[PDB]
Structure formats: structure tokens, C-alpha cells
Write a protein that binds this ligand. Sequence first.
Ligand SMILES: Oc1cccc2ccccc12
Length: 326
Amino acid sequence: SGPVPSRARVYTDVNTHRPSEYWDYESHVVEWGNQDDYQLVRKLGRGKYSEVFEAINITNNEKVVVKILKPVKKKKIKREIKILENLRGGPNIITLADIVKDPVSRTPALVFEHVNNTDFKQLYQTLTDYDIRFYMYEILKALDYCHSMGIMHRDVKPHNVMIDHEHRKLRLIDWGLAEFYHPGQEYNVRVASRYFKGPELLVDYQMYDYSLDMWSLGCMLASMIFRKEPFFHGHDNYDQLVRIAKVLGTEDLYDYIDKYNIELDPRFNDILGRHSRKRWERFVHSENQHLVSPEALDFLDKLLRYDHQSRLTAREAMEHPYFYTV
Ligand SMILES: Oc1cccc2ccccc12
């Protein structure tokens, strides 16, 4: 009679005991300042619904980042602004400094604190075993904080992790896919980048929680310690699950779908196959052995699990021996 329900093991009722104003983003009143206080300097990047610029606040001569959001869908922006305002000031959370509109275009624009980002492809080659442990712990601080605030990022990936390595500063950015956790709520599974999508989304199990973020974090850790980017290299959403199965075996996938009474899409019939559970040590090679340790492997094993309930919470992850040196 449908799928078996599930709930978060931590911060389960944090939003339930909160007033609706905190999580009712649809009712949140957004007030837009004048963009004339900001002078655009140069374009930094371009997203599907966003153009990002480096800018100067002409009232204090401070550099900022301006995200000109394309009004593809309102409420989503309301959701992102409400979440950004709720988390504003939290450890390693990007600071939303202002919300503005250009007088002529009337285009919505989010103003963030400036982060002097080190290129990922440049970072990935200079980071030591210590650096990986350090930055993973910084990400866990941001995740345990937003989960405690009843929020799941739902888009954890390297490009959403901004690091100023010189200043050892880290920020979790892009909260446009983030959502408020409400126990028993069925969410849209079309979230996260393919490589970091958790098995719950690929099997279309809508009653997921903060643990989705812990799966994505595990994908990042695996790519970093094994120097294989991405780790689960799917070519589509269907193939992505097949790639997870090629490492965690097809036995636990059926155990997981049976535990939650999940109906597998017929598209999986001819592509899924039969696979065995691999030892994490099989991914160790000469090029990555300086980043691997029994602690790192035990920690990874406890994040990359089919069962979202069985994964370490961000708070449990922070207590792992892998972080004793931080
Ligand atoms: O050093 C790292 C550790 C964990 C995650 C990272 C994400 C981006 C760039 C570097 C990272």
C-alpha cells in the first residue's frame, strides 16, 4: 500500500516546534534595496538561471559577489532568500550581505560576501592528507549547523564548496535547491548533481532527509582521497544507480528497496544487472596512497551506504577517528 515511511534520526522536529514564519517561505516578504550602491566589476561565471559578478559596494569600497538570478521561477528565490537569511552568520555558510534590484531592468539580485576562491583543479593536486581532513571537518560544521536549523542543502558538490586556501577559509554556497525538513514530507527527487545524487532519489523514494547531504559528502570524500573525479560516474540518472551498484553490490539495493517497499522503475530492468560488494582498498593506487588510511576508509564506508538511515549524521561524522588530527 505504497512506500514505507521514514524520518531523520537527528533534528527530526526542529521545524515542527518553530513558528510558521521560519519555514513558510511563500509568506516571507522580500524587500529589495537599490542596486545603484553596487558597481559590477567582472563576470565570474554563468549558471542555468544565474549570472555571477564580482562587484564593489560604492558606500564602503568593499568587494562583494552579485548573483543576478534569472526570474525563471519565483518562490524558489523566496525559498533561497528565506534559507539564506535563516542561516546567515552560521559557520562556513555563505553570507547573504544584501538583496537588490536594478532600477531599469527590475531583475532580482543577491549580494554575497566575497570569497577569493582557489580553483578546484588547482586545489585537488596540492592538498595533503591533513588538508582533506581539515576541509572535510569545515564542511561538516556547515552541514551540522544547517541540519540543526532544519535545512537540507540538497546540492552538495565540489563546485558548491568555495575555499580561500591562503586564508584556510571555506564556504558552502548555492542554497537554491535547499529545503526545510518536515518529518513525513514527500520531496521532489530531481535535486543534486547526478554524480552526488543519493540512491533514494534514483529509486524515487520521496521521504528523504538531511542524510541525502551525507551521501553527497561521501561522494566528495571518495573522489578526493582516491583522486577519481567523479567517483560514481553515471551518464544519466538511471546509469548513476548502476554505477553505485557496481561498488556496493546489487544485494543491498534490493534489501534497501524491500526495507522501504520501493517499486523500481521498469527502465532499470535491462541495465541493473548483478554485482558484488567491493573492498574500499581496491581503489588504492600509487597516485593516491598518500591520501588514504584505514581511518579514511572506515569513515567513507559509514557515509556511502544505500540505507539513508544507516549513514553517519554530520554530528556523528565529526566524532570519527579520521578527524582526531584536526
Ligand atoms: O580539500 C577538500 C576537501 C573536501 C572537499 C573539497 C571541496 C572542494 C575543494 C577541496 C576540498
